[PDB]
Amino acid sequence: CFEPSMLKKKQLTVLDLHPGAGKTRRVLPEIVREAIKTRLRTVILAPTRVVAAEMEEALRGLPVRYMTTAVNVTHSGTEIVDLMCHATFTSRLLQPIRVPNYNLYIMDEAHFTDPSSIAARGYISTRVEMGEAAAIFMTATPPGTRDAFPDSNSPIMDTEVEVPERAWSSGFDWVTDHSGKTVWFVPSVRNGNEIAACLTKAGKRVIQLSRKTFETEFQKTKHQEWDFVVTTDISEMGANFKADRVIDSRRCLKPVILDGERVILAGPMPVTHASAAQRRGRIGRNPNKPGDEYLYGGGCAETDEDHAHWLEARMLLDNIYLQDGLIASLYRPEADKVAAIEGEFKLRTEQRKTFVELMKRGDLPVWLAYQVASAGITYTDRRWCFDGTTNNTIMEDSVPAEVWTRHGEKRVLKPRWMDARVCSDHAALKSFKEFAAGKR
RNA sequence: AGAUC
């Protein structure tokens, strides 16, 4: 557990805090209180806006500068502790701006495999190793460890079963015979949709959660009766429930670079040990409620090295300036997840500026931004959005998607490099259309 | 799938 001696420079501490152990409400304030009392310049790194808002509740009264609109409180201007999201921190590292010499980094949910989160751990662990700072990584599943069944406040009954992944008419009575409340983790919104429809037809009250619907629907899980919550992995962080059962597909959808040539979003993919632990962690939370159950449908990924986020993290980190043109390494227990030599993706000054702007203003995925920038294309030159090979044609309602261009032409979307993330749902496609049209 | 400005 935490002790003030961990706040010394050159010290990286990983706090293994199992789900429900009090990471945010108990441990985080203890650390922050000690940093403030010693006026240690500190950044708290929240994985998401949702979690940042939860942190403010835990830290309320303590002087923290919240560098996210997810929180609105009155800053005094003398606070020595900053709070921001993982991605915000990494974005600011890429900008030609002053990022403080934080002497302490506190990273919540340090298993998070968002590319910005991975890159942040590399930067941070590198600064600690160089003796410039201390860091505390907090998570139920520290990088390098593979326990899908961590500790819990109450013992959990773990059972591997055949979990249905499509609507069913028979053969899975145990699903609907349950008289309690179930949280069901699915790999995609569309998959969730089908399962939810099946459950609703069977007379169940279902609430569905995903990034798109979370803000409104999660509140309903607190205020309405429900039999099932059918949720994507949005609920692996920042979400808790009063339930006695988790059903876990043990599957996910994550971007993968195919043949080094394009990015796909491919199913089926097994979840990681860390994600399985987060999912299971939704129950067994109350010592007064024994008997919670975790029903899971298969194994975890032996490795997630095929996930695009590892290479993308190195693309980010290769372009973050440290000192003297030094380049930070990935956090050691994670470093072998990418085989590229250190520096492989470092861009020269002008191409690097383009890469950064393509992500920050363009909202493009790291991999795609890198392709465009390394090709020597300028940020505002959108011709590449239309001159790919035919198999890169983007479809909308199974007919080719079209854009009115900056030059008043209606053209078919056909990007020179194909990244499935620019068109994987309506919002992504709308965003990419506006980019192709030169409108941001 | 998820994620920030």
Q: Å between A174 CA and B4 C1'?
A: 40
Beta strands in A179-290, from DSSP E residues, in sequence order: 182-185, 206-209, 228-231, 245-248, 251-252, 255-258, 262-265, 269-270
> Are A420 and A360 contained in the same domain?
yes
Give the residue ranges of DSSP H helices in A281-423. Answer: 308-317, 332-335, 349-360, 366-374
Residue appearing with tokens 């059972």: A159
The answer to whether A7 CB sits below 7 Å from nucleic acid chain B is no
> Are A116 and A218 contained in the same domain?
no
Tally the C-alpha atoms within 13 A of residue A106's C-alpha that lie toward its C-beta: 26
Chain B nucleotides with an atom closer than 7 Å to a protein C-beta: 1-5
How far apart, in whole angstroms, are the C-alpha atoms of residue A317 and residue A89? 12
Cα A183–chain centre separation: 20
Count of the separate structural domains present in chain A: 3
Rg (CA), chain A: 23
> Are A434 and A358 contained in the same domain?
yes
Tally the C-alpha atoms within 13 A of residue A223's C-alpha that lie toward its C-beta: 5
- In 3D space, the residue among A309, A383, A321, A311 whose CA is nearest the CA of residue A352 turns out to be A321
How far apart, in whole angstroms, are the C-alpha atoms of residue A327 and residue A234? 32
Beta bridge partners of A105: A43, A135
Q: Distance from first CA to last CA of chain A, Å, rounded?
A: 47
Provide the sign of the torsion angle of the four alpha carbons A274, A280, A285, A288, taken in this order.
Answer: negative
> For residues A98, A45, A309 and A307, what is the CA-based torsion angle, rounded to 10 degrees?
170
Contact of A180 with A58, CB cutoff 8 Å? no
A122: DSSP letter: H
> Are A237 and A185 contained in the same domain?
yes
Q: Å between A215 CA and B5 C1'?
A: 19
> Are A297 and A361 contained in the same domain?
no
- In 3D space, the residue among A122, A139, A42, A121 whose CA is nearest the CA of residue A84 turns out to be A42
Q: How many CB atoms lie within 10 A of CB A333?
A: 14
CA angle A192, A289, A225 (to 5 degrees): 45
Beta bridge partners of A159: A295
The answer to whether A68 CB sits below 7 Å from nucleic acid chain B is yes
Cα A404–chain centre separation: 33
Peptide bond before residue A96 is cis, with ω within 30 degrees of 0: no
Beta bridge partners of A410: A404
Experimental method: X-ray
Most distant CA pair in chain A, distance: 66
β-bridge pairing A245-248 and A293-296: parallel
Contact of A83 with A107, CB cutoff 8 Å? no
Q: Which domain holds residue A384?
A: 253-267+342-440
H/E stretch holding A194 reads: helix A189-201
> Are A114 and A10 contained in the same domain?
yes
β-bridge pairing A42-46 and A104-108: parallel
A9: DSSP letter: T
Provide the sign of the torsion angle of the four alpha carbons A113, A117, A120, A124, taken in this order.
Answer: negative
Phi-psi region of A152 (alpha: psi -120 to 50; beta: other; left: phi over 0): beta
- Helix-helix angle A115-129:A86-94, to 10 degrees: 70
Q: Which of residues 411-430 of A touch strand B (CB under 7 A)?
A: 421, 424, 428
A383: DSSP letter: G
The answer to whether A249 CB sits below 7 Å from nucleic acid chain B is no
Beta bridge partners of A269: A252
Reported resolution, Å: 1.7
> Are A63 and A137 contained in the same domain?
yes
Tokens of A145: 């460890």
Closest residue by C-alpha to C1' distance, nucleotide B5: A88
Q: In what order do the strands lie in the sheet with A228-231?
A: A157-160, A293-296, A245-248, A182-185, A228-231, A206-209
H/E stretch holding A270 reads: strand A269-270
Q: A295, A323, A341 — which closes off a domain?
A: A341
How far apart, in whole angstroms, are the C-alpha atoms of residue A273 and residue A288? 27
Tokens of A332: 């050691």
How far apart, in whole angstroms, are the C-alpha atoms of residue A284 and residue A294? 9
Residue appearing with tokens 């078919």: A412
The answer to whether A29 CB sits below 7 Å from nucleic acid chain B is no
Q: Å between A305 CA and B5 C1'?
A: 28
Total residues belonging to chain A: 440
> Are A260 and A382 contained in the same domain?
yes
A84 in helix, strand or coil?
A: strand
Tokens of A316: 């980010």
Q: A314, A341, A368 — which closes off a domain?
A: A341
The answer to whether A113 CB sits below 7 Å from nucleic acid chain B is no
| Nearest DNA or RNA nucleotide to A309 (CA to C1') | B2
Contact of A43 with A99, CB cutoff 8 Å? no
> Are A247 and A236 contained in the same domain?
yes
Q: Å between A428 CA and B2 C1'?
A: 13
> Are A191 and A287 contained in the same domain?
yes
How far apart, in whole angstroms, are the C-alpha atoms of residue A355 and residue A312? 12
CA angle A120, A239, A366 (to 5 degrees): 30
How far apart, in whole angstroms, are the C-alpha atoms of residue A316 and residue A370? 9
Closest residue by C-alpha to C1' distance, nucleotide B2: A234
The CATH number that applies at residue A247 is 3.40.50.300
| Nearest DNA or RNA nucleotide to A51 (CA to C1') | B3
Closest residue by C-alpha to C1' distance, nucleotide B1: A253
> Are A97 and A157 contained in the same domain?
no
A74 in helix, strand or coil?
A: coil
Q: Å between A161 CA and B5 C1'?
A: 42
Give the residue ranges of DSSP H helices in A14-113. Answer: 28-37, 49-59, 86-94
> Are A25 and A129 contained in the same domain?
yes
Please report, as a single letter, which amino acid is at residue A207.
Answer: I
Q: Å between A297 CA and B2 C1'?
A: 22
The answer to whether A212 CB sits below 7 Å from nucleic acid chain B is yes
Phi-psi region of A148 (alpha: psi -120 to 50; beta: other; left: phi over 0): alpha
Q: A278, A303, A328 — which closes off a domain?
A: A303
Q: Is residue A348 classed exposed, middle or buried when 0-12, 13-18 and 19+ CB atoms within 10 A define those classes?
A: exposed
A215 in helix, strand or coil?
A: helix
A53 in helix, strand or coil?
A: helix
Closest residue by C-alpha to C1' distance, nucleotide B4: A87
Q: Which of residues 288-347 of A touch strand B (CB under 7 A)?
A: none
